[PDB]
């Protein structure tokens, strides 16, 4: 003579949602460092990310030309004129360390001690004084 | 830890670049970070 249990939440969950959303889904996370998100979704979202990046770059008032302006596909071309260094991204964030300066007529190129320049770039970016000009 | 780490044939001579490197935080003051977003 036990009355029938309704369990409106669990019933509505098991009615059409054939999964375990209304429960702790951190089994593979609390005892394993698995990838939470952005597993393969980045593949299709890369086009929209690049579009948004280009839109934000165009919207942001860039500095003068100064023979250092460059624009191409793929990402934001920092500078390619002559021997200028190249870089790209990865409010709005500001990434770095995508390429480097170019030279020729060796004497054997410079080694990775250039991190000093990268350290200064990161410090000046996190200072947020004027990223484009410096 | 055997294949490679920093640089094999990373010869001085033009390391002189170092020499000038010793100009640059000086040509211009490093900005404070303290932000690991």
């Amino acid at each position: 003579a036990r009355l029938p249990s309704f369990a409106i939440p669990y019933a509505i969950d098991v009615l059409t949602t054939g999964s375990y959303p209304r429960l702790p889904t951190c089994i593979r996370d609390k005892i394993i460092p698995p990838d939470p998100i952005t597993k393969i979704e980045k593949q299709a979202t890369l086009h929209q990310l690049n579009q948004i990046l280009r839109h934000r770059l165009v919207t942001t008032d860039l500095p003068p030309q100064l023979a250092n302006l460059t624009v191409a596909n793929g990402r934001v071309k920092f500078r390619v004129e002559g021997e200028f260094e190249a870089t790209l991204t990865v409010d709005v964030p500001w990434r770095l360390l995508k390429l480097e300066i170019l030279v020729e007529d060796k004497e054997l190129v410079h080694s990775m001690q250039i991190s000093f320049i990268h350290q200064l770039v990161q410090s000046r970016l996190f200072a947020d004084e004027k990223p484009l000009q410096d | 830890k055997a294949k490679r780490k920093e640089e094999p044939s990373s010869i001085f001579q033009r390391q002189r670049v170092d020499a000038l490197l010793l100009d640059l935080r000086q040509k211009f003051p490093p900005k404070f970070v303290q932000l690991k977003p």
């Binding site: 350290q119 | 970070v33 690991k36």
Partner: peptide, 24 residues
Amino acid sequence: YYKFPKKKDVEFLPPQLPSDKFKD
């Protein structure tokens, strides 16, 4: 690397290079 990247201090120069292989 990720971690916290709070390596402030100063220096930001040195060299971090190696090629000692010519009787010198």
